Amino acid sequence: RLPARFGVEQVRELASRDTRQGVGAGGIAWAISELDLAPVYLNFAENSHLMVTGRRECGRTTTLATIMSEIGRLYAPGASSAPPPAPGRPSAQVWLVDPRRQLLTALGSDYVERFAYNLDGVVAMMGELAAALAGREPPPGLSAEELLSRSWWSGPEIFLIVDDIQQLPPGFDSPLHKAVPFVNRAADVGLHVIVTRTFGGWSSAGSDPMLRALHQANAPLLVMDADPDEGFIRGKMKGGPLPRGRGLLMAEDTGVFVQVAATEVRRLEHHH
Ligand SMILES: Nc1ncnc2c1ncn2[C@@H]1O[C@H](COP(=O)(O)OP(=O)(O)OP(=O)(O)O)[C@@H](O)[C@H]1O
Numbered sequence: 001r002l003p004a005r006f007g008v009e010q011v012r013e014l015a016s017r018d019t020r021q022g023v024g025a026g027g028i029a030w031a032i033s034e035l036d037l038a039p040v041y042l043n044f045a046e047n048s049h050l051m052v053t054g055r056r057e058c059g060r061t062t063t064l065a066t067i068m069s070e071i072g073r074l075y076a077p078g079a080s081s082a083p084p085p086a087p088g089r090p091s092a093q094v095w096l097v098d099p100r101r102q103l104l105t106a107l108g109s110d111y112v113e114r115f116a117y118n119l120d121g122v123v124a125m126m127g128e129l130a131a132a133l134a135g136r137e138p139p140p141g142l143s144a145e146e147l148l149s150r151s152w153w154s155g156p157e158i159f160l161i162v163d164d165i166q167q168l169p170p171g172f173d174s175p176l177h178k179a180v181p182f183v184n185r186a187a188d189v190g191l192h193v194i195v196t197r198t199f200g201g202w203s204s205a206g207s208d209p210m211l212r213a214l215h216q217a218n219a220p221l222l223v224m225d226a227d228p229d230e231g232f233i234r235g236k237m238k239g240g241p242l243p244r245g246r247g248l249l250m251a252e253d254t255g256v257f258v259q260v261a262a263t264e265v266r267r268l269e270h271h272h
């Protein structure tokens with residue numbers, strides 16, 4: 001069964017030798033499964049997003065750091081000042097909400113288009129992001145012949161990565177409300193929303209429009225070390241105590257235990 005630590009260098013060894021179908025192979029490799037000790041991916045063919053939750057120091061930030069490292073491996077740099085990508089390569093652009101500033105250097109400025117650490121910064125950044133996403137569709141009222149001619153928007157894959165979403169205001173106040181309309185058609189606008197939240201008060205966190213939209217889109221939910229007392233999370237599954245880095249990867253009614261690939265974060269600040 002699963003080890004207490006499995007490095008990202010280790011999962012990459014496995015990913016380069018994995019040709020399994022229907023698991024998102026060739027994509028972001030961020031964990032290994034309890035079932036077969038094989039890689040677990042962000043299967044963008046199934047879903048564009050990911051939610052991660054768990055109690056204090058379960059490994060939420062490290063999970064994002066591993067995913068970001070994978071983005072750097074699999075994608076050409078897609079920030080505005082980055083060079084044109086090598087032929088055949090997809091491009092990735094990161095929009096980072098990181099209040100505790102732990103993920104600022106997981107990727108260089110050739111990947112990170114915008115990052116925000118204060119509320120005003122988040123509000124401003126989300127406005128810019130929404131404007132870019134709104135442009136990713138054809139002009140209205142074109143003929144069939146016109147629509148056939150080309151792809152009408154161009155640009156890199158956009159990763160909206162948010163650590164510690166619990167620190168943001170909930171409700172309609174939420175700065176993330178401008179990105180909500182794109183969640184359901186994320187694949188068509190090349191959007192990926194990856195968010196973490198502390199497990200405390202999880203069932204009462206539906207009040208966040210982004211978390212609600214992600215649940216409505218049936219995004220994968222990794223429930224790391226957690227408390228059964230919060231009740232059922234998805235279907236008949238409750239959260240439970242787990243070693244650090246380990247989580248129950250939930251769909252709607254089913255789940256599988258995984259061990260998240262570890263990577264270094266110089267930056268870890270827990271406010272002890
Ligand atoms: N995948 C992992 N495998 C093994 N250990 C891990 C893993 N992820 C995190 N840890 C360990 O757990 C500790 C906390 O890491 P991290 O800061 O990522 O957690 P966190 O949940 O974000 O914490 P916080 O609650 O402060 O946000 C660190 O010591 C880290 O080494």
Ligand SMILES: [Mg+2]
Pocket residue numbers: 060061062
């Ligand atoms: Mg953290």
